[PDB]
Amino acid sequence: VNSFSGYLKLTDNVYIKNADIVEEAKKVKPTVVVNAANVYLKHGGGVAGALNKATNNAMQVESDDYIATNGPLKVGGSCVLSGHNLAKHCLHVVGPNVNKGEDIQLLKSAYENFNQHEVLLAPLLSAGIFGADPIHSLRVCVDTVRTNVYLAVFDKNLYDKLVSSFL
Ligand SMILES: *c1cc(C(C)(C)C)cc(O)c1O
């Protein structure tokens, strides 16, 4: 049993809810919250900007130190850092950004990072301002992630479309 409430069960291991991931993290304090990161860990907008704002910029300060030491992530790669006030850990995962012309085949590689964690609160990778089709992102998630993933979908209209169209 875990603390996640109000989710619709899509598969054995994938659950979905219309929720603000920031507000969900603050309530649950999951072991792992996933950030929709870029390779520079520049948390300007989208899910990353919202998560970072909720940490009072402490996520960005920590991220800048990481990049200064390690250099940029790979597209499809991830980095576990602090979860600050939101979670124990934040798994920063880089999905391909279609609005930068990145290979959508890298979305499966991105989701494979989730398999290193038994339970996660996450957004749909490469959705929103990363430009991919969220229906596609949900299909790759279900077909890739084997650990237990609780997906937060901010937009109610999109949530209802994801559920209604789910095979
Ligand atoms: C973030 C990222 C990484 C790798 C997997 C080396 C990119 C390591 C690490 O300790 C971290 O915090």
Swiss-Prot record:
Description of activity control: Inhibited in vitro by GRL-0617.
Impact when changing S164L: In strain: Gamma/P.1
Subcellular location: Host endoplasmic reticulum membrane
Residue stretches making up the Macro domain: 1-167
Catalytic activity: Thiol-dependent hydrolysis of ester, thioester, amide, peptide and isopeptide bonds formed by the C-terminal Gly of ubiquitin (a 76-residue protein attached to proteins as an intracellular targeting signal)
Domain of life where this protein originates: Viruses
Membrane topology: Multi-pass membrane protein
Function field: Responsible for the cleavages located at the N-terminus of the replicase polyprotein. Participates together with nsp4 in the assembly of virally-induced cytoplasmic double-membrane vesicles necessary for viral replication. Antagonizes innate immune induction of type I interferon by blocking the phosphorylation, dimerization and subsequent nuclear translocation of host IRF3. Also prevents host NF-kappa-B signaling. In addition, PL-PRO possesses a deubiquitinating/deISGylating activity and processes both 'Lys-48'- and 'Lys-63'-linked polyubiquitin chains from cellular substrates.
Subunit composition and interactions: May form homohexamers. Interacts with N protein.
Name of the molecule in the record: Papain-like protease nsp3
Covered residues, full protein: 1025 to 1191 of 7096
